[PDB]
Amino acid sequence: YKEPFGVKLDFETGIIENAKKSVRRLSDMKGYFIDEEAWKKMVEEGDPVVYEVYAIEQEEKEGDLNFATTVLYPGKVGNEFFMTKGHYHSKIDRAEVYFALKGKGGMLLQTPEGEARFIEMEPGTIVYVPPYWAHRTINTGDKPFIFLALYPADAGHDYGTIAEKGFSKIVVEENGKVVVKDNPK
């Protein structure tokens, strides 16, 4: 029997005690943002951190669970909001649940069929990511967007398809938040 345990989540910083920290900067997201120019610039300008993850994962097993907080920093590449890479589950069949804790943003989801959905998120918002849906998180505010994510330990990660094809939509700023089609999709 594995040992149960408790860990403290700081509602202000989004940091989970004893978690495994991962960091993703702009230089780690080449080929994701539409404005390749503005991208290249910002990188040489300082290669700012886009988001950080604090994860506690179990071994890949059916029926088990992993969880992690993400701190998605405010910003835009051109006029495209800072976002996570986005991914499907290796076992695409796996669902996921997100719980927004601080700031504001939204999640962009897409199916293999091609359907695209955008769900706005504010503190208190619980987002249900169904089986087969790829999903990416976007920060539409000027402050850090913090959320907790819980997912099957055997769900796995499939980034390839997204890095290749990309999402059928992009989330940009045009006075307000606009969800429009993605040219290179």
Among 42, 129, 146, 171, binds a copy of itself (CB under 8 A): 129
Single out the residue of 98, 175, 165 nearest to residue 138, CA to CA.
Answer: 98
Stretch in the footprint of a copy of itself (CB under 8 A) among 27-35, 41-49, 107-115, 163-171: 107-115
* CB nearer a copy of itself, residue 77 or residue 121: 121
* Length of the chain (residues): 185
Residues 106-165 that bind Fe ion (CB under 5 A): 151
Query: Residue with the closest Cβ to ligand 6PG?
Result: 84
Query: 86 is in the binding site of which of Fe ion, ligand 6PG, a copy of itself, none (Cβ under 5 to 8 A by kind)?
Result: ligand 6PG
Give the three-state DSSP class for 43.
helix
Place of tokens 């860990």: 7
Residues 16-55 that bind a copy of itself (CB under 8 A): 16
Query: 173 is in the binding site of which of Fe ion, ligand 6PG, a copy of itself, none (Cβ under 5 to 8 A by kind)?
Result: none
Does 8 sit near a copy of itself (CB under 8 A)?
yes
Q: Which residues of 148-185 are buried (b: 16+ CB within 10 A; e: fewer)?
A: bbebbbbbeeeeeebeeebbebbbbeeeebeeeeeeee
Q: Is 89 annotated as a binding residue?
A: yes
The three-point CA angle 99-104-108 to 5° equals 70
